[PDB]
């Protein structure tokens, strides 16, 4: 779900950036309410995420080549030998059905090599399950002697916003998703709107990203009146302030001049102490899934020489306790923890 | 001293506008804890019917299966609940889905080409190019296919765009619509927006008559501040119409001559429906859920 | 891609108002603001939903591996 | 009166890709040192 920025420099159109949207316009409230948002952590609305807000997909392509001059491995299934329930993922040709759900261990293709006289399969292996988007058979680098050996398989990996995923405004204010807060528990505006994203007010005094502050009252003004605003640098002056410009626009529409909104608590239901700073800010979802190195090991495999847990997250590997952690365990005088 | 009968004496309801989709009603002399409870229930706890299990047979469209399945779930169905029983999750799929627990909606669209003189319109250039919510055909099955005879399953908003196609592409699916609550997923929330706003209070400390009264009148929306004459003071005609912009406080001539507060007891509720139930039915069920929640705890053994 | 079903913030159905919005801008020759008002979008959250929609699906559809040329 | 976004213009161009000169010349002007550099390898004066 790509969206055109309300607040934008006019050069965005000059480069036709609308052909490739990079973000979405979100209702962002500068509020410290949940308690889970603080400095590097921001809150995303549950009901917003449930409605497809910031949803993304990731496509991965694999090349299954049979080269390792006489042809031995052939795409498909060998006669007489056939291990149980493989036909659920692959078609008669040995290639997978485009659209099929696959998990690590599932067969991604099938072939038969005469050297071993057995029907083998190339397994799909990744922590993230996928669906087959595209299967292309390529039989090139031959004049008359044609036979397929090379196949390109595209995987569609669905990626909903998870706790840990980074999100950022166009002002360098990145933060990890601390929690997907429910709309009932979310603070609700006088208008009846609950913010899509919650940014903590303690982020701004150190970063000094005032561009985001003016973007908030500009985005709100442009959403109400239905007009895009120019946010090209040095357009405004010390005499002609944007906070006054969009402030006048906000007052004319029927909202508070200083970009504030009277909000009520989602828990107690009572009106909050003061009016909360709410607006429309163009937010970007960063591609990284930070919890990629998430692992747990009780008793996994060990190296033959050292008889110590082997290195490798996916291999059920061990976490290294290095010299500094050794030093720290000596430090506490905690000899049994070191042991 | 607070009695439940003493509450009946002061508690008032005022209906401003009651449309087929949205109802604007007031809850006078009630606590925040009760008004917020109904609000929370109307969004999260009032059960509704929405597509949950989309079974795809073919999808050659540009829109991915996951995305297309999610869009069908988001489409509100003009289905009254209570007609459906709650599905049990522990027993298997063959026992799980029945004529009392599930509603089936099928989508079978194939795009082709049409001869027309050529910018040219997609409805002219291609046949079945745009897939709408109205294209979800209701299929009644089992023991009861006569209970939904005078009540056909149709999406609340039919003109909702579900998919866009080009000749050669096709969509074939069987969607299983079930009963769920808004707390689980936003697709099950029967309300578009159930929110309350406290009655704005404008405490005029000084008479502020004259030309300053005309200046004070422009600080609030048109139908809020009313002036009798040049004198006879400056009164508040309809404090309910106020937007609470605090525009009056950003002026030196009024910053100390007026106070802006609220009526903590008075709540202005605005409830819009997705299309399945009427906004009154949604509020009534919310009060019925709060009562049932307190009733379930009343007739319950206090363990340990 | 296509117009989202329901407003991300509140949940007001917006998916049935995309084609109707372009008709209010083309045939009726109205401004962006007045067009959204006639569709029944008064909250700025519902306002930006359609106003800010790109509709890349029309660009995406022009690549069809099922029909020649 | 404003520095608005092209909505009607955008959607029409999405359906109708121009048959004349491509829109956004600055985008082609961005890759001008790359294409131009390789163009001068065969085309231009002195062969």
């Amino acid at each position: 779900t790509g969206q055109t920025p309300i607040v934008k420099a006019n050069l965005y159109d000059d480069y036709g950036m609308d052909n490739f949207p990079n973000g979405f316009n979100a209702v962002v409230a500068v509020i410290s309410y949940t308690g889970y948002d603080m400095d590097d952590a921001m809150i995303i609305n549950k009901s917003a995420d449930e409605r497809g807000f910031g949803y993304g997909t990731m496509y991965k392509t694999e090349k299954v080549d049979l080269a390792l001059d006489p042809i031995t491995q052939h795409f498909g299934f060998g006669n007489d030998e056939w291990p149980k329930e493989w036909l659920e993922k692959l078609d008669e040709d040995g290639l997978p059905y485009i659209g099929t759900y696959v998990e690590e261990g599932d067969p991604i293709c099938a072939y038969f090599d005469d050297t071993l006289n057995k029907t083998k399969i190339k397994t799909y292996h990744s922590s993230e399950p996928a669906y087959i988007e595209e299967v292309n058979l390529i039989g090139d680098e031959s004049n008359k002697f044609q036979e397929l050996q090379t196949v390109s398989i595209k995987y569609r990996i669905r990626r909903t916003p998870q706790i840990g995923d980074k999100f950022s405004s166009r002002h360098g204010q990145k933060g990890v998703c601390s929690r997907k807060w429910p709309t009932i528990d979310m603070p609700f505006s006088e208008t009846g709107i609950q913010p899509d994203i919650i940014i903590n007010p303690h982020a701004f005094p150190s970063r000094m990203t005032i561009g985001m502050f003016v973007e908030s009252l500009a985005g709100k003004a442009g959403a109400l009146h239905g007009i895009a605003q120019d946010s090209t640098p040095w357009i405004f002056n010390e005499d002609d302030t944007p906070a006054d410009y969009f402030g006048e626009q906000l007052a004319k529409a029927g909202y508070n001049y200083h970009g504030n909104e009277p909000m009520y608590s989602g828990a107690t239901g009572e009106e909050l102490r003061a009016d909360i700073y709410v607006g429309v800010v163009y937010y970007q979802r960063l591609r990284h899934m930070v919890n990629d190195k998430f692992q747990v090991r009780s008793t996994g495999p060990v190296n033959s020489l050292t008889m110590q847990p082997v290195k490798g997250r996916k291999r059920h590997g061990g976490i290294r306790v290095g010299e500094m952690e050794r030093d720290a365990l000596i430090g506490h005088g905690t000899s049994f923890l070191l042991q | 001293e607070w009695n439940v009968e003493k509450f009946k004496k002061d508690f008032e309801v005022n209906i401003s506008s009651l449309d087929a989709r949205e109802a604007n009603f007031d809850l006078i002399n009630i606590d925040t804890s009760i008004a917020n409870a109904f609000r929370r229930i109307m969004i999260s706890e009032v059960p509704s019917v929405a597509a949950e299990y989309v079974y795809f047979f073919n999808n050659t469209s540009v829109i991915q299966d996951e995305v297309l399945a999610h869009r069908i779930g988001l489409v509100p169905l003009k289905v009254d609940p209570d007609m459906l029983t709650w599905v049990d999750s522990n027993l298997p799929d063959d026992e799980k889905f029945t004529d009392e627990n599930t509603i089936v909606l099928s989508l079978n669209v194939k795009c082709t080409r049409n001869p027309d003189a050529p910018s040219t319109d997609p409805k002219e250039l291609y046949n079945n190019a745009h897939v709408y919510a109205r294209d979800l055909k209701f299929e009644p099955q089992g023991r009861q296919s006569t209970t939904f005879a005078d009540c056909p399953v149709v999406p609340a908003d039919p003109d909702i765009l579900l998919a866009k196609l080009r000749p050669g592409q096709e969509i074939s699916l069987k969607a299983h619509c079930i009963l769920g609550i808004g707390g689980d997923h936003a697709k099950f929330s029967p309300v578009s927006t159930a929110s309350y706003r406290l009655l704005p209070q404008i405490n005029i400390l000084q008479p502020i008559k004259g030309e300053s009264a005309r200046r004070f009148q422009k600080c609030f929306p048109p139908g809020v501040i009313g002036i009798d004459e040049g004198s006879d003071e400056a009164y508040v005609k309809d404090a309910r119409k106020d937007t609470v912009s605090r525009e009056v406080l950003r002026y030196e001539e009024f910053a100390d001559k007026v106070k802006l507060g609220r009526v903590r007891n008075h709540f202005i509720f605005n409830v819009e429906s997705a299309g399945a139930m009427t906004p009154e039915e949604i509020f009534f069920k919310s009060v019925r859920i709060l009562k049932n929640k307190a009733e379930y705890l009343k007739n319950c053994p206090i363990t340990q | 891609m296509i117009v989202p079903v329901r407003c991300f913030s509140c949940g007001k159905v917006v998916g049935d108002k995309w084609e109707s919005y372009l008709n209010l801008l083309q045939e009726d020759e109205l401004d962006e603001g007045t067009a959204l008002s006639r569709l029944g979008l008064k909250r700025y959250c519902c306002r930006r939903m359609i106003l800010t929609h790109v509709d890349l699906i029309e660009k995406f559809l022009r690549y069809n591996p099922l029909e020649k040329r | 009166r404003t520095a608005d976004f092209r909505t009607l213009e955008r959607e029409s161009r999405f359906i109708n890709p121009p048959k004349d000169k491509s829109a956004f010349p600055l985008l082609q002007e961005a890759v001008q040192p790359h294409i131009g550099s390789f163009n001068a390898l065969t085309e231009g004066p002195d062969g």
Binding site: T191, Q249 | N24, K241, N270 | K42 | -
Partner: peptide
């Protein structure tokens, strides 16, 4: 230096919950 041009004919487009654009 020329000031940023203000937008032509900006009206009220936000009111109370149960109140429409009836008041002009």
């Amino acid at each position: 230096r020329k000031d940023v041009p203000k937008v032509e004919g900006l009206k009220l487009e936000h009111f109370a919950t149960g109140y429409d654009a009836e008041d002009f």
